[PDB]
Amino acid sequence: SNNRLFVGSIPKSKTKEQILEEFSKVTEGLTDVILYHQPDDKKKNRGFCFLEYEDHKTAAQARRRLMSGKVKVWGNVGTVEWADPIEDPDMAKVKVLFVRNLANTVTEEILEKAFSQFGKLERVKKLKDYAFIHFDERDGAVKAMEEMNGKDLEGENIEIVFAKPPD
Numbered sequence: 001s002n003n004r005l006f007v008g009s010i011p012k013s014k015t016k017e018q019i020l021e022e023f024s025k026v027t028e029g030l031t032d033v034i035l036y037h038q039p040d041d042k043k044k045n046r047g048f049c050f051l052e053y054e055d056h057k058t059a060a061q062a063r064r065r066l067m068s069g070k071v072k073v074w075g076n077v078g079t080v081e082w083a084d085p086i087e088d089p090d091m092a093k094v095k096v097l098f099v100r101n102l103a104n105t106v107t108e109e110i111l112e113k114a115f116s117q118f119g120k121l122e123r124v125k126k127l128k129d130y131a132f133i134h135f136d137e138r139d140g141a142v143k144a145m146e147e148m149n150g151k152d153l154e155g156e157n158i159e160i161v162f163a164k165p166p167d
């Protein structure tokens with residue numbers, strides 16, 4: 001599910017065939033390579049790509065491996081990162097934020113004011129020191145989490161994940 005690595009720099013002339021060969025040479029379980037081509041000449045790539053592995057284990061072993069100095073792929077010029085699902089979506093994706101580390105003085109209203117900046121809230125539900133924040137659309141949750149995570153609310157650094165759906 002988390003099975004894709006981001007690769008920050010590859011030679012922009014290399015085809016998807018050649019990227020598969022190169023990275024398949026030095027890691028196990030490589031299963032796909034997702035390339036974007038320079039729209040002005042479809043034959044070149046945009047200088048980055050995604051590596052897909054059969055599972056998250058494999059992708060995880062591969063990342064460690066490519067990050068070790070133990071082996072070199074086209075110079076190791078850029079970083080190899082986990083892919084960010086926020087960044088490349090894809091189906092009812094989750095528009096509920098789970099917020100923890102809520103200071104004593106934080107109310108449902110204060111939560112509404114702070115999180116309303118990013119899009120229409122459907123409901124704020126505060127518990128003891130954590131809260132559920134229902135956004136009308138996923139894009140509002142994505143923005144709220146990106147901008148608010150780790151931020152100070154009433155003296156407390158709040159921590160934000162997408163909620164686990166009860167389904």
